[model samples]
Target: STGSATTTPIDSLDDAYITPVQIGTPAQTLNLDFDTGSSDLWVFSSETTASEVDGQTIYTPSKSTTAKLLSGATWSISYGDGSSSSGDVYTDTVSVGGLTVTGQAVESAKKVSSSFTEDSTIDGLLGLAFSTLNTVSPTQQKTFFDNAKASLDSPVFTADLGYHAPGTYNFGFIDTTAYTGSITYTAVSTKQGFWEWTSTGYAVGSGTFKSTSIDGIADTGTTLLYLPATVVSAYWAQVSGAKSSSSVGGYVFPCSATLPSFTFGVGSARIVIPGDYIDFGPISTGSSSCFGGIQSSAGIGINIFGDVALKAAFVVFNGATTPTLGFASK
Candidate 1:
């Protein structure tokens, strides 16, 4: 029951171009990051002479008339806040939304971070969030949807994420009106990239710890979540008096009051995060607190369910087959 395709809106950290489809051929094209919290897919290279890709947005297989070069291998990345980047490895012919794939294999990271080379318009990152966490090799294993769910057609991979800015980073297709039931699947453990699971408890309105269950880790390349300071102070003590702005460390209320709505649990499902997704915007010292839509690291060990529970559900990442993740209705 998944229909109604055609929405594509983008913002919240931009930069696009993801065209990776491989069976009929025409795959490979990278530089992504529609990141809702953290997944993985890296770029920036030329053999990284120690961080310097000029203005950045460098992926040139001879200016790609059609590229592919995963022979020299070589890749590196680290971020949980420590931040890092490095690269070399190629494969080309990529695109997004309209779809196009041909030999896709990417990893250009030649050392980055001048806040991603002074940012002009998002350079890279396209991890539709979900991780088995693979850095490289059988090293610690890997999972970037095991190479983008083998170019998705039906290993099921859907992401709408509408309204933002710039060229938009849309993917294959699947829109399914908005919530029902019968798409709650999970089974992708070959060990690697985009690995996120564990969040049996958390809630906001009814003020629940629900027997307190938490192992949290769901990142769309990180924009916010990082829960667990006792579930972020029992969901900000129901927001009523909600204080602790410390200028902007987190937890502030009174945008006209009346705010409460948040939930989390994955084993049996149960997403529900709305209060305009913890709506935020007001910390230029102006005191509206500048909501970026929910903030507060809470104890921050790892409870990042970013994109604020993915724009309210409809995230299926079949990772090529049994590398599962499903939640329909959008």
Candidate 2:
């Protein structure tokens, strides 16, 4: 009734995390990005154009005895990464870790954008957000987590993202041994279909923790942490040669600069993002300029607590009688 999976980084920057999933009766395994930011479980399948399917595994519905087309049901989604995919739908047996869902809606990709082809490691996405954001039309399908929670020992899941290393995701139960201190809980705003929450304040490096409420979603799908410009500037200001360059886009600094850690307050809990995490990585091969993991959220409309922040703590996505989000240091 519960599940566990290992998250693997697709690239050097730790931009995205992928987990293997088994779909169909015969169990065709594919490495899927476990994206909490989106609500569509879509994959590159037999229906996708050959050109767009390069380097990734494809889901062949015909090979699965349990696969049945959900006639008239179709889906389309565009991601923050600029990749877009549209597809047909089918209800089949889908499994993540050891948890199984008999009639899971598997969105089969008919068309995909260049970004998908450019990244070969990700075969599809397994959405872990609210089912209200499901892209399938005619009937909005439930997410794998949504459908599986009812049968779980506890209606909850946890995300432990690693920095350039493998991390574990667990469902139905919380592993007390996985975290250091007690989890500090917070209310979740699901109106917008995201695991949205807010922080009480934030501190840049060893700076003061400014008491200002900052609302955002805990999106594992996203790469970096985005915050208000004022907050972002505070962090980068401490590092020499850091600036918002129009040419390089966003904030970039000398790779040799000493970066500082970022801290945020949630209820009574505090999470500190390590300094090395802020380094992001070099701008180019052998280049001294590096991109920042924390950036301004001015144009994004909403702040995002992405991998850079999530990896600093253990996150509990509780889908019990009343929705709640919990965080703990690991």
Candidate 3:
């Protein structure tokens, strides 16, 4: 009725977190990126004509005795830089960490995007967002979590992301040992099919708490944290030599600059993202300026609290009737 899985950062920069998933009869194990921003569970499989890449693993559904083609149903999703995959659907026995779902919808990509072909780190995405965002048509599919919730001890999943290290995902219950204090709960709005909530406010370094309301979503798929221009500007303002570089395309600062920790409020709890985590990485290997992980979401319209903010605290994604989010300091 519960499950736990160790998830690791795909690369040193912690670009994405991937977890192992067991699918089909005899179990074709595949490492898939667990993305809470998206809702479709799609994978690279034998159905694709694009063939194979070195690090990529393809699932041969045909070889699985329990794999059943979901007739008339299809699904697709965008990857990056105009890269997308769309194709056939199948139902199979899928398991993650020890939690099993008998008839989980597995979207097999026939048109494997070149972006995925070249970027060998990601084999597929296992989305945890609300099933309403699922791309599958003619009877849209449920996500792995949605299908497994009924059997879970508690319909909740927790995300404990690490900075350039291995983390863990817990299904069904929250691990109290993972966090320091009691979890501060907040209402979640799944209207947009995201773990959307209103943040109480933010503070720059050890500065005074400035109480305000910021609407945003917790997206594990995204690597950076995005906030309103006001808050973003406030953060960069504290760091000397930091500026928005048009050439590099976003905010950048001297690699040697000392940055202040960013503290944000999740309900009554304050999650502090260390200065080191804010310095995402250099724009180039030998470049003097480094890109900032926290940026303005003015252009994107919606504010996003992604990996940069996520890694700082233990997050609980409650899947109850009226969903609520729990954030605790670690």
Candidate 4:
């Protein structure tokens, strides 16, 4: 079976993308972040304290006949940005687009960190990564995609993220019309439970392409493109008034400063991130300073190709066999 869903940028934040997903028999719809960085279908639920839920729409398992609690099972997840959630597990029918998966493991959050509660729009997270990364305790849980892949025509999914615009996440099939030109393929290391790949290096503007291969994971949950400190420094060096500011959280530059286009090499393909995209808009309301969409992956260990970089191309996540990523311009 195939499925396609539209992704909308988070208001004001414009960091993560959210898509509509249905859970339970009668289908309790929730706006979820389709994250490839982690594996766990978690939602704000009846189990969560109303006081801790903020403005999120919660799922009520009691209303669905198909919802079954996984007795004694629990799940907890923590992110690099310090956002964490913990809850119990339930089996239910989950649907996205025209595809449906029965008995999918749905983690109902009873406790959420401030980061999640403060985000009023997002009701949950739908993970698209390998099932091996799922956090269900007592027994590992499988992602919705993994559970439905066997009956799919092909175990593949495509991420077509746009810059401040609507895009799509297509599963089990690739829409040729979504991208232009040829698709370049690259090998991925799945040992880390991520779509990890190496870039042959990158280029700043029209400058020389550095051949320094950097290993990074494709993370849809993250907002910025994170690279080595030296690499990030090299890019900002060309900007007139750009500097890394602790208070601002990352490199900031004049709002009107012209940015240099950044290009990352994937096999023979050069995925170019236009200069305009690098300027992630003003750091805060009315602030003349702006944050760089690209930053230093100092403490994260592995580099991350977040939405800033992914939005520059149409990414095909092939899970058929040896996982691989196919990139092409949109």
TM-score: which candidate is best?
A: 2
Q: Write the per-residue lDDT of candidate 1 for residues 147-182, one digit (tens) a residue.
A: 444455444555544324222223444445444675
- For candidate 2, write residues 174-264 as lDDT tens digits: 9899899899999999999999999988998888889999999999999899999999988889999999988987999999888899998
RMSD of each candidate relative to the true structure: 15.9, 0.9, 1.4, 1.0
Each prediction's TM-score against the native?
0.32, 0.98, 0.97, 0.98
Cα deviation at 30, candidate 4, in Å, is 0.6
Give the Å error, residue 242, model 2: 0.1
Whole-model lDDT values for every prediction: 0.52, 0.92, 0.89, 0.91
- Model 1 lDDT on a 0 to 1 scale: 0.52
What local lDDT score does residue 137 receive in model 4, on the 0 to 100 scale?
94
Backbone-clash count (model 4): 0
RMSD of 2: 0.9
Please list all clashing residue pairs in model 3, or write none if there are none. Answer: none
Sort the candidates on TM-score, descending order.
2, 4, 3, 1
Candidate 1 total steric clashes: 63
Q: Put down candidate 3 lDDT per residue, 63-84, tens digits, no spaces.
A: 9999999999988787422668
Candidate 4 residue 177 C-alpha distance from true site, Å: 0.8
